Amino acid sequence: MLTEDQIKTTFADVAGCDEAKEEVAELVEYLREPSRFQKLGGKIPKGVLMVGPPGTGKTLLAKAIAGEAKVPFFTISGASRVRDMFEQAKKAAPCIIFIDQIREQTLNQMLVEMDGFEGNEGIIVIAATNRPGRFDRQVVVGLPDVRGREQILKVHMRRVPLAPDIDAAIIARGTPGFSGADLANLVNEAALFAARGNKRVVSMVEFEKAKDKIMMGAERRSMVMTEAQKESTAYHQAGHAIIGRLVPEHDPVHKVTIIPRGRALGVTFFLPEGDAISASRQKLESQISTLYGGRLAEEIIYGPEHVSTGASNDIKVATNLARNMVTQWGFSEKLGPLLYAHMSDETARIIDQEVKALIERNYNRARQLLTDNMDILHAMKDALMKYETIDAPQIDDLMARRDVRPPAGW
């Protein structure tokens, strides 16, 4: 299943993954001109394995390779019968074979062909899926860094007009772990979204709209909630916010919103402001106090008899983070640095008492902060209603004990 082509994918079109690009260009240089290797180039690399995560160009270096070198054929893909592949891939074979449908005589057969019946054409296997000599060099095609996000976003950005306010880095930042595909969609749906309202110029506003519709369910506004339900979910979806600021070393607050998306009643967003190299104990502790903040915000205002089963998911991740700290990253003085993840019955008790002590300490801190800053909570409950959504400039105005400015737009 191989086809002769004239125009196909090159290398300069792909972005990011510079190391993978480097190994690709080495293979491309090699594919012809073997005489350059007077140092015994020595069995042109046989077998290339990409163990990268699925979805980020795991097979785009294959397309790039097939187009590259002016070798006019592609992957050979697109049981037993491989030997017919060995037979056909001897004459006029455009320098590779790529085999992704995910019994290893391929090594002996390929060696025999490349030694006897192949005039240094260097047809070798390169494969992608998710011992030395059969898979010698394995090249990782990984998820882009934020720098890479900027590049790819600019690359697909060619096709449209731009309104002045576009800042590619922020849009890149908000997509942690989005592949090339996900960015491609972000742009595409920006275009579609702008068309829906028939807007000539496309700016960052609909851009954020598209990002949101991607990660979370698209806005589902037709649902009705009573007057009081709108009010309660406004406190709980604040409180998350007023704590995100006062606790130390946290990702800053980007958005606080109230209209339901998918299965969620309200959302508070965060922006990593970098890539996750590692975490401090301090910031890990701060996360907990931000998480439970909503339930406390709901209890102080309403009474402990009316606190609702809305904090279920907020509770779960909190308890999951808590026990990881004690169990498998050190972080507890009594037990000491060890890995407890068959133990005794006494040990199973000390682990629990430590977990409870941690959550209790931060829960008290979270309770203390809200009581002192009561004016903000009422001030922020109000604006959350008058306008349905709050951006970053507005939140800072609240947190400074000042007047709220109207949101961007409206």
Residues 8-27 that bind Mg ion (CB under 5 A): none
What phi and psi values does residue 59 have, to the nearest 5 degrees? -125, 25
List the interface residues with ligand ANP, window 134-193 (CB under 6 A).
152, 155, 179-181, 184
Instruction: Determine, following the binding rule CB under 8 A, whether residue 344 of this chain makes contact with a second copy.
Output: yes
Instruction: Determine, following the binding rule CB under 6 A, whether residue 54 of this chain makes contact with ligand ANP.
Output: yes
Instruction: Determine, following the binding rule CB under 5 A, whether residue 106 of this chain makes contact with Mg ion.
Output: no
Lookup: tokens for 78: 């697109």
> Token pair 């002016």 is at which residue?
70
Q: How many residues touch Zn ion (CB under 5 A)?
A: 2
Instruction: Determine, following the binding rule CB under 8 A, whether residue 201 of this chain makes contact with a second copy.
Output: yes
Q: Which of 2, 31, 59, 395 binds ligand ANP (CB under 6 A)?
A: 59
Q: Which of 20, 31, 60, 124 binds ligand ANP (CB under 6 A)?
A: 60
Q: Which of 20, 44, 46, 58 binds Mg ion (CB under 5 A)?
A: 58
Instruction: Determine, following the binding rule CB under 6 A, whether residue 14 of this chain makes contact with ligand ANP.
Output: yes
Residue 356 to residue 408: CA distance in whole angstroms: 43
Q: Which of 314, 388, 396, 397 binds Zn ion (CB under 5 A)?
A: 314
Instruction: Determine, following the binding rule CB under 5 A, whether residue 244 of this chain makes contact with Zn ion.
Output: no
Q: Which of 220, 378, 402, 405 binds a second copy (CB under 8 A)?
A: 220
Lookup: tokens for 389: 């959504």
Pick 24 or 355: Cβ nearer ligand ANP: 24
CA distances from 395 to 36, 130, 172, 246, 252 (A): 63, 44, 22, 13, 11
C-beta separation of 17 from 142 below 8 A? yes
CA distances from 220 to 193, 216, 269, 313, 389 (A): 16, 11, 18, 21, 14
Q: How many CA atoms lie within 13 A of 96 on its CB side?
A: 29
14 binds, among Zn ion, Mg ion, ligand ANP, none (CB under 5 to 8 A by kind): ligand ANP
CA distances from 46 to 114, 120, 136, 260, 333 (A): 10, 13, 7, 53, 52
C-beta separation of 65 from 24 below 8 A? yes
List the interface residues with a second copy, window 88-117 (CB under 8 A).
100, 102-103, 105, 108-109
Q: Write the secondary structure of 32-81 as one string of H (helix), E (strand) and C (coil).
A: CCHHHCCCCCCCCCCCEEECCCCCCCCCHHHHHHHHHHHCCCCCCCCCCC
78 binds, among Zn ion, ligand ANP, a second copy, none (CB under 5 to 8 A by kind): a second copy
The site map against ligand ANP for 101-140 (x = CB under 6 A) is: ----x----------------------x--x-x-------
* Min dist. Cβ of residue 301 to a second copy (A): 13
- Stated length of the chain: 410
Q: Which residues contact 363 (CB under 8 A, 6 or more apart)?
A: 288, 289, 292, 296
Which window, 65-73, 343-351, 371-379, 387-395, contacts a second copy (CB under 8 A)? 343-351
Pick 51 or 335: Cβ nearer ligand ANP: 51
| Contact footprint for ligand ANP (CB under 6 A) | 14-17, 54-60, 105, 128, 131, 133, 152, 155, 179-181, 184
